[PDB]
Design a binder for this molecule. Structure first.
Ligand SMILES: Nc1ncnc2c1ncn2[C@@H]1O[C@H](COP(=O)(O)OP(=O)(O)O)[C@@H](O)[C@H]1O
Ligand SMILES: Nc1ncnc2c1ncn2[C@@H]1O[C@H](COP(=O)(O)OP(=O)(O)O)[C@@H](O)[C@H]1O
Ligand SMILES: Nc1ncnc2c1ncn2[C@@H]1O[C@H](COP(=O)(O)OP(=O)(O)O)[C@@H](O)[C@H]1O
Ligand SMILES: [Mg+2]
Ligand SMILES: [Mg+2]
Ligand SMILES: [Mg+2]
Lengths: 164, 356, 166, 190, 190, 166
């Protein structure tokens, strides 16, 4: 295991999971999808301010929240993710968050072992999360059908405001 | 400061320092005695070979202390009492053995800090995965360990006595059919080198044998240490074929392609989908070129047609179990997770069960 | 502004905001101790599942408030202090259950207002998850917005305001 | 509407309360512990006779989905059994998550019959078609004319294909002939 | 006799059916797939930790006879483990057909414990001491007084030395104190 | 005169005459094809053992009737045409299994009479191999000798007499 989580990531998770009554001007800077990284010393899980996605921009500059999110993951390193999905089922309309464990084969072993052995140190601190998505290849995470297959299986008819 | 990683292999003890790319000390696990030379010395010398780790479980504890003493002094060339040593154990290991290992390590060598990890979870983490069945085909045994988010299911762990040792024995048996009589322990090393350098798993055994019986381009040429050049024909694919057809050796147990399917069908029904597409191979025996394709073909023949089978085989799967432990022990945040001698003095040998 | 409607059923917990067609949060109402885990994480995972609600009465209260905290924070990611919550129950229900419901909602979460309706009456509203549909179509009604029991009304009345109001 | 008895049957409890033009009758509130979970247990118990053992809780969800998307209530039990006995015209296959396929026959309409014949899982309670009639007969004699023609159904258990027709037929079999029976079956009653 | 629940556990299936004064209760028939074959498999799996590998079917019969004539059920698991941990006072040797001798320790009472703790072979089912209590609690409330004092055991798996005492102790641990528990252990129950 | 009682269990086949204490024929119920052999010869001998009976239902019928013919001829050295046979089964059993049992016993062996009892009821009889003890103590009873289904009764009824009789 080893690596633990910092206070900023826990604060961001508590901010994203539990939303409250907010003003229409502030509600547009909420966090939609944020990744997690390691510092220089590889001892804390820190979010990078560079790569991120806001809730405000979704549907505007970012035509597709998921489509613009696949290319945001670096293919030469291991990364965490937290995607807020809005999928439509035959039964009803749900809005859940997804934990994506990005781990390509092109990354070095030093970045794969650290992120694989410390996954229980981050997932345990993220209380209330259900949808877990472990993705190693890039083609499997690039496809749109896999998210509906993991979320609800064949029941999900539409994903992110558009049908499958 | 630096941590040691002594992998207790069934036929090759892998030892080295944390952070390196590969183990430094690699020697066969044998304790020679005349009618006590341990490890590499036994092969050079009239002795009865003994294996204390023959089948993945330490049944002869008396020789394990000598094995570890040799590994620490004459192989790693470092003092054990000044460097922490990480150890790996085979799956389905009893609690008594897990306690005896740490008790010996703490009472004989007096190492300040140690840690015991499972080979299966280390080999799975070394492939960038946390959920998936790992194929640990070593020198003495072949284990099929299905793991779920880093927690191996002990009820579905299949153990197979077919491994590289029986493959070497079958190669020795089939090489005498042409006229090459390798009977002694010295020629056994040459047979092992031939198996490592010239053997390969065929995609279709029956079809490959048809071309081997007619074509002459498949025959290779090996150079003996004494200068003789022996030619090997259809024995390149017949030797590793036993792993899929154990009728060659005589055991009724199914091949490594069917034990995997039998172990996957023993776990939960909802996690079988993540086990068929996360089959990881490890051990030195899975280093044959073309074994992943044969495994995928056999599983797709066995598994249902609807679900897909993805077989990933890293090029460093031979020492992946040691590389994983080395990277885990070389962590800058792992120095507080070791089992120091004070906690051992407080809690007895049972501390390893709570810590690990 | 919006109101929460929480159909704390015996087998499923349909929880969602008001004014929408479908409940966003649906999961079995069981807690599992290692042989806690609530809902889908319990369904996926070595546990000993058990239902806190019998035939309508809430047998155990710690796991019930745990499920409420879960569906409020780890499932909807909202605080109860902002939006009013709407609870449902079956008729011919022991008054102790409704009293404990009101006490838990007003003391642990400190909601601004709440209400305890009847599942069948709401399922009839939906006719023009039926209970949740009726609760959601009921919470948007303007005439109903006046009869929520509020904390300021709850202080002097104690946990007995629910019988006289609802 | 405000008038009519409600047949609410979810996953754990089935209860009926007749409600008039705003005043409900609490003395006629019937409660039956037979619901979808009991139906799933009965389906698991009767599916072992075909060679499919579901013991664990995780598996039981597969049986739950099978009951949700493959089970229906017959118009009558006897003739549907006669059709089940003769031919496989009734059998239908299902795609399991593991890859295997199963062939269920009379179990498609035998396990939903427990709603009307509780003697299958062992309960002594009158089926959902008799508890409603007994509660209406316990109600007032002037509101029975309005409660007979208004039987509002709800819950996920009332989503079987053909449950409305059987409920109707059973109630007009129990109720007098001159009275007309109506079974409001909304498409969003889940 | 005609009254009492039956604990029938053979080589492949363990099932319990409570029977009153001629009328049995089919709705409380419990079935557990844990039996002697599973115990033999668990003994084979746990005997490899001592250095004795039994892989083939022919050999497995030797393990079956070893379990038949060397295995017993403990009064309680914890104290017997404490005695197993300390000293070899518990170990006993066996004469193999090939001529070798083996020394089994805690395996004499660990593999029969699977009957009460199915989590060893991986099953999620409640042990044989809890399924009987759950079936009696599913039975009628007036026949429980007669079923508690009549637990008829049968089959070859119920022939371990001390299984009757542990069954008793477990049932009076589960059943109320005022009720008296009796475990009929006939000498020809095989 | 004597009656045969055959407890065709899932793991063992206890077969013997009526009126005696212990079953004379006991062997595992498996058939082995060379990689047939039934019972102890299969246990001694390169085969691929498999059980024709799953959890009570008979999966394969050819090997089941083969085991029946074996335990009748090569183990007891008696013909089924003379002594009536008694079969056992578990409750909550598919009717197809009992129908095929009756059809095989009446068509292939042509028994004068037979009966399909319940294993647990017989094991209770033994209380005053328990199933076999109860079957053997049951077959000697005079009152039971009248309710055997006979071939003359079986002709017009077909293989459906067993459900209405037993
Ligand atoms: N490149 C190779 N090709 C074929 N066989 C190999 C190769 N490398 C190693 N082996 C076999 O693997 C065996 C050693 O396995 P080992 O690393 O001891 O497994 P474990 O670590 O699980 O005990 C040797 O007996 C050797 O025959
Ligand atoms: N399409 C369907 N057909 C038949 N049964 C269904 C269907 N959908 C759901 N069910 C059953 O209904 C149950 C859900 O009941 P529900 O209405 O959610 O109860 P509650 O309102 O108390 O949560 C499930 O257990 C399932 O077995
Ligand atoms: N003396 C004994 N002690 C413990 N177990 C025994 C003994 N004798 C037999 N057994 C177990 O009982 C099993 C036999 O079960 P049995 O009663 O024949 O089942 P069935 O009645 O279904 O044939 C054997 O597999 C064996 O493991
Ligand atoms: Mg290894
Ligand atoms: Mg409901
Ligand atoms: Mg039996």
């Amino acid at each position: 295991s080893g690596v633990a989580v910092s206070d900023g990531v826990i604060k961001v998770f508590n901010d994203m999971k539990v939303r409250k009554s907010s003003t229409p001007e502030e509600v547009k800077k909420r966090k939609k999808a944020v990744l997690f990284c390691l510092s220089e010393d590889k001892k804390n899980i820190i979010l990078e301010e560079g790569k991120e996605i806001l809730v405000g921009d979704v549907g505007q500059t970012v035509d597709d929240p998921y489509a613009t999110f696949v290319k945001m993951l670096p293919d030469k390193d291991c990364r965490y993710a937290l995607y807020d999905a809005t999928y439509e089922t035959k039964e009803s309309k749900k809005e859940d968050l997804v934990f994506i464990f990005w781990a390509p084969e092109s990354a070095p072993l030093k970045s794969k072992m650290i992120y694989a052995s410390s996954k229980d140190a981050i997932k345990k601190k993220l209380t209330g999360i259900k949808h877990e998505l472990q993705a190693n290849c890039y083609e499997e995470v690039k496809d749109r059908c896999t998210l509906a297959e993991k979320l609800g299986g064949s029941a999900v008819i539409s994903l992110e405001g558009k049908p499958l | 400061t630096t941590a040691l990683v002594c992998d207790n292999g069934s036929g090759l003890v892998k030892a080295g320092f944390a952070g390196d790319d590969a183990p430094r000390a690699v020697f066969p696990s044998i304790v020679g005695r005349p009618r006590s030379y341990v490890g590499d010395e036994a092969q050079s010398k009239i002795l009865t070979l003994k294996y204390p780790i023959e089948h993945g479980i330490i049944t002869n504890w008396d020789d394990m202390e000598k094995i570890w003493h040799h590994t620490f002094y004459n192989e790693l060339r470092v003092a054990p009492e000044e460097h922490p040593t990480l150890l790996t154990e085979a799956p389905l290991n009893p609690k008594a053995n897990r306690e005896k290992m740490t008790q010996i390590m703490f009472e004989t060598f007096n190492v300040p800090a140690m840690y015991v990890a499972i080979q299966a979870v280390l080999s799975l983490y070394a492939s960038g995965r946390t959920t998936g069945i790992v194929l640990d085909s070593g020198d003495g045994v072949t284990h099929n360990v299905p793991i779920y988010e880093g927690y191996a299911l002990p009820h579905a762990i299949m153990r197979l006595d077919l491994a590289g040792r029986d493959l070497t024995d079958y190669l020795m048996k089939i090489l005498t059919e042409r006229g090459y009589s390798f009977v002694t322990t010295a020629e056994r090393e040459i047979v092992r080198d031939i198996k490592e350098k010239l053997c390969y798993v065929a995609l279709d055994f029956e079809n490959e044998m048809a071309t081997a019986a007619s074509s002459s381009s498949l025959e290779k040429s090996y150079e003996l240490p004494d200068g003789q050049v022996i030619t090997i024909g259809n024995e390149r694919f017949r030797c590793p074929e036993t792993l899929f057809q154990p009728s060659f050796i005589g055991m009724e147990s199914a091949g490594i392609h069917e034990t995997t399917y039998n172990s996957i069908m023993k776990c939960d029904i909802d996690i079988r989908k993540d086990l068929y597409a996360n089959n990881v191979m490890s051990g030195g025996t899975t280093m044959y070129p073309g074994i992943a394709d044969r495994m995928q073909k056999e599983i797709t023949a066995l598994a249902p047609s609807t679900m897909k089978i993805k077989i990933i085989a890293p090029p460093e799967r031979k020492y992946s179990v040691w590389i994983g432990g080395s990277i885990l022990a070389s962590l800058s945040t792992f120095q507080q997770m070791w089992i120091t001698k004070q906690e051992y003095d407080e809690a007895g040998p049972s501390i390893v069960h709570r810590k690990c």
